[PDB]
Design a protein around this ligand. Structure first.
Ligand SMILES: [Ca+2]
Ligand SMILES: [Ca+2]
Lengths: 302, 301
């Protein structure tokens, strides 16, 4: 019989309504699930919940949090058949992409999910999200980092926020020895190019401490290309995402200024992948070459 | 019979195969295509810009050139179709919406990936529909026509969608100026440093569009809020667009750092609207108030 580890890392799913808003209550999630027979059906896997203290606030969390989640998966990896990571919904897709890069040789399912409402409340998708995540982690395993929301299973490093209040992978079809790499915060600019953006503005985006820049550009101004080439000549890694809802960069003026294509990668995959590559002992050229390679299913280059 | 002005400002639709511009090519081809002369279709006049504008190398001065050309012809035609390169069409469509106050004739922006000549071109269909709609199914607004749909110009986002409005299908025209403006458009991500956000806000930045998490969430991260508050203290307008494909900002630590909501505006609408309001000699507070008002159909309050 399958057994699933559930990491309650943070998010509203396990919290309680007060008048001053949602508040954390130690062990509340498991006490509420003990009252919910759907979770104890003989078709369902066994599962255990561990709670992080303090809970990670997903709107104010760092790459050190990604590391702590990955270390927790690694510690439990051999004891369970699969892993569900409960998380705040607003940066869930960043956590999912980061974990995809950090967990090399992953051969068990890892499903990130959460809910905006405490899971006992009428309007909460908490119960349905956790039930499906548990069931999918046990029985229909894709040995990857996946994300479960709005009733679908997405590939983790292909999901992007898709409504304000909330997930899509616009560039991939929905799905339905463990090595952990180190990751640390990195100074990365993610900027949107628009008509007439000035040299002075772009120059400022490239000041220290920036080590890399993600450009979201259109589906050749001398002063823009000059600043980008100068940045690449001092080792700044510049990645172009043809920032539209869906589709790919096909790179060339940008190429000649040292910009590399991010192909159809989401902002979440590019940002987490640069954190991953900059945190290893790689040179700018090695990072440029690896950013363009499909490392974990995040990008299509034929 | 309605008369439609067609400004071929640029884009592949009027070129030859790769793709080279050929003076008069579009008009010679359209005179040969009988569907353009059916009795349901308007009369039309083509003006080819010389030189053509490259849509990937445009500035707000190009927006103003197109607005001036509409203004110059306004009283001579019943409607306007603007042919444009597809990659910044939605920026031009939004910018014109703010510049053309009390517009009482249709303006439809369109274009195509492939020359209108070629068998596999949506050129023909895009221009047939634009001409027919400009004449016959007039909304007096700046609209954009692509992928067989008519969008509100300041609600379309990149190959076009208006994710926050359904597809469409007192004065004379008063024309306002838009000039280039130093605007930062940046995406917050987990752990983004104070030092990187400080850089986005250095002189000469006059306004910042913040693309942040969910229904307006940005970290309670002190170092981010400090930089955003310092920008508000200097009269830098910071506008929060809540990162998802679709839906609205609902504001609050960001409000306390002086950030205002951009509600459900597209990045194109917010960026062109800041260009517009910074060009009109208004104070930071008047720009914060007008950013949040629905001026031209761009936002749901
Ligand atoms: Ca002209
Ligand atoms: Ca005033």
């Amino acid at each position: 019989k399958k057994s699933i580890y559930v990491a309650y890392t943070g998010g509203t799913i396990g919290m309680q309504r007060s008048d001053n808003g949602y508040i954390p209550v130690s062990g509340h999630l498991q006490r509420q699930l003990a009252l919910m027979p759907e979770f104890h059906d003989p078709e369902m896997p066994d599962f255990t919940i561990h709670e992080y203290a303090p809970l990670i606030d997903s709107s104010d969390m760092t790459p050190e949090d990604w590391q702590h989640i990955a270390n927790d998966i690694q510690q439990n990896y051999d004891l369970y058949d699969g892993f569900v990571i409960l998380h705040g919904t607003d940066t869930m897709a960043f956590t999912a992409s980061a974990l995809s890069f950090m967990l090399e040789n992953l051969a068990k399912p890892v499903i990130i999910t959460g809910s905006q409402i405490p899971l006992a409340e009428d309007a909460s998708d908490g119960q349905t999200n956790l039930l499906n995540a548990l069931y999918l982690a046990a029985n229909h395993p894709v040995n990857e980092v996946s994300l479960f929301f709005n009733n679908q299973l997405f590939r983790g490093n292909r999901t992007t926020k898709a409504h304000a209040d909330a997930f899509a992978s616009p560039n991939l079809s929905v799905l339905l020895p463990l090595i952990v790499h180190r990751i640390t915060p990195q100074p990365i600019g993610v900027v949107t190019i628009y008509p007439g953006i000035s040299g002075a503005v772009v120059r400022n985006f490239l000041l220290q401490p920036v080590k890399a820049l993600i450009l979201r550009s259109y589906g050749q101004k001398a002063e823009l290309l000059d600043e980008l080439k100068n940045a690449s000549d001092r080792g700044i890694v510049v990645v172009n995402l043809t920032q539209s809802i869906s589709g790919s960069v096909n790179m060339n003026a940008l190429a000649q200024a040292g910009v590399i294509s991010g192909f159809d990668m989401t902002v979440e995959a590019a940002l987490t992948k640069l954190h991953y590559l900059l945190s290893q002992s790689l040179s700018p050229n090695e990072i440029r070459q690896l950013m363009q390679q499909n490392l974990r299913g995040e990008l299509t280059d034929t």
